[PDB]
């Protein structure tokens, strides 16, 4: 597989990346506490937002409104309007670092998760917390909404992946599955957009694929390779492929049905922390120690 690199930012370490739905922009949230807005067509730094102390691990655009959300090691979830260029409000509530934050695709909700061992759901119009999901016994490193069902998947350093039934779209939330298999902490999880599958990535250097029925869930297979912690993973939305990124300085592509290696991409001296895909285009971004790369695959 070929990587067609479209843009590379050079910066201090980047942690999060978010693709705008219609403009050729990405937000990149940095370890230094700054949030950068880049035009990746021209390669221009359009703006920089300063509203956190310490790393900014979570970053996401709203799908239709001129809003983005950021989440930081200062424990805050911040909501911004990028047209007016203003920080609108802070959702404080988390009691330790925020690891992820994202908007729901339809409801006026923000999802966040934290080292405080909770996943929280906020209504961004009323600006209050509407749900707190407890159960993990260590940091929650990742949480994500299912694209079509009332489910959330989360990953924790407690070595489990959890699937939560959220119900309460209309207690609010119950744990449906607890997935054990990783022998070390789990850093990331993802839903397939259409199949009942989940991917996870761990400090065991493994990416695991799981499947769900209405009543059961279990481990399908393992992507073996990576020689350090696997930071992030996702399903290719248009091909039967798995993508993963790791502190071993590689992005790897694997076949979804076989878990065989397809391609490895390396950087000389940059650990990878995060990968994402554009919500409409076949466009990917990866965050690493020296900035962010935006690329297409074959």
């Amino acid at each position: 597989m070929a990587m067609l690199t479209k843009f590379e930012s050079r910066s201090s370490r980047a942690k999060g990346v978010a693709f705008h739905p219609t403009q050729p922009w990405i937000l990149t949230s940095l370890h230094n506490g700054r949030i950068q807005l880049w035009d990746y067509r021209m390669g221009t730094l359009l703006d920089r937002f300063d509203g956190h102390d310490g790393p900014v691990r979570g970053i996401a655009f709203h799908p239709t409104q001129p809003i983005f959300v950021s989440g930081g090691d200062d424990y805050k979830v911040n909501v911004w309007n990028y047209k007016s260029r203003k920080l609108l409000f802070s959702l404080c509530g988390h009691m330790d670092y925020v690891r992820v934050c994202t908007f729901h695709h339809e409801y006026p909700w923000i999802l966040s998760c934290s080292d405080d061992q909770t996943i929280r759901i906020w209504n961004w119009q009323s600006r209050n917390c509407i749900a707190i999901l407890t159960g993990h016994s260590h940091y929650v490193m990742c949480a994500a909404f299912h694209p079509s069902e009332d489910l959330i998947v989360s990953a924790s350093l407690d070595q489990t992946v959890r699937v939560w039934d959220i119900s309460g779209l209309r207690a609010d939330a119950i744990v449906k599955f607890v997935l054990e298999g990783h022998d070390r902490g789990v850093n990331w999880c993802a839903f397939h957009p259409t199949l009942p599958l989940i991917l996870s990535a761990g400090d065991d250097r493994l990416v695991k694929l799981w499947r769900m029925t209405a009543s059961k869930a279990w481990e399908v297979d393992t992507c073996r390779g990576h020689f350090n912690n696997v930071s992030c993973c996702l399903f290719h939305p248009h091909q039967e492929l798995i993508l993963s990124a790791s502190e071993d300085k590689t992005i790897r592509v694997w076949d979804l049905n076989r878990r065989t290696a397809v391609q490895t991409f390396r950087r000389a001296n940059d650990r990878f922390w995060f990968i994402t895909v554009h919500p409409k285009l076949n466009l990917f971004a990866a965050a690493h120690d020296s900035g962010v790369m935006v690329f297409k695959l074959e």
Binding site: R13, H31, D115, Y139, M141, N187, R271, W273
Partner: peptide
């Protein structure tokens, strides 16, 4: 005492 700081 904390982990995953990078």
């Amino acid at each position: 005492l904390k982990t995953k700081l990078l």
